[PDB]
From a paper:
Biophysical characterization showed that all designs are stable and bind their intended targets with affinities in the nanomolar range without in vitro affinity maturation. Therefore, single-domain antibodies targeting HSA may provide a tool for enhancing the half-life of biologics.
The crystal structure of DesAb-HSA-P1 in the unbound form further confirms the correct folding of the VH domain. A highly dynamic CDR3 loop was expected for this scaffold. The highly dynamic nature of this loop likely stems from the lack of strong CDR3-framework contacts, which is why folding and stability of this scaffold have been shown to be insensitive to mutations in its CDR3 loop by several studies. We selected this scaffold precisely because it can harbor virtually any sequence in its CDR3 without marked consequences on its stability. However, the dynamic nature of the loop harboring the designed motifs likely also explains why we were unable to obtain a crystal structure of DesAb-HSA-P1 bound to HSA. We speculate that this dynamic loop, even when bound to the antigen, retains enough hinge flexibility to embody the resulting complex with a degree of dynamics unsuitable for structural determination. In the absence of an atomic-level structural characterization of the designed interaction, we resorted to epitope binning through competition experiments. Conversely, DesAb-HSA-P2 does not compete with the other two, as its binding is not affected by the presence or absence of other antigen-bound DesAbs. This competition behavior is fully compatible with the rational design, as DesAb-HSA-D3 and DesAb-HSA-P1 were designed to target partly overlapping epitopes, while DesAb-HSA-P2 targets a different epitope on the opposite side of the antigen.
Numbering used by the authors: 2 to 102, 111 to 128
The structure:
Amino acid sequence: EVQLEESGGGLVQPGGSLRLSCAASGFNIKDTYIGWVRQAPGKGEEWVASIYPTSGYTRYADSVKGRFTISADTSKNTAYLQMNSLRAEDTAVYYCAAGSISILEEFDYWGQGTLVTVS
Ligand SMILES: C[As](C)(=O)[O-]
């Protein structure tokens, strides 16, 4: 009865920007941390960011600091990832994940992924 649904993926030119959304259902995101994890085809998982929506506290992987911004709209029970200055190395499936209040083994719920392709 819990779902995470990502959207916003697609094709982006190098240097471009993209905003992903993660709509949560079956729980209140204020009761959790929501995270974004990416994995390219043929490569391993990389956690990029987490947010605690009730407090606004955010955490970023060093590799995306400044370039990526994680946010939430608790009125829509939705988290977002703003990605700027995209490079080929950012090509990946981006998964939203959540856990009841940097590690991917601390998430209870996982989305379906949304594919981001940088030319
Ligand atoms: C969560 As961190 C990479 O800013 O110590």
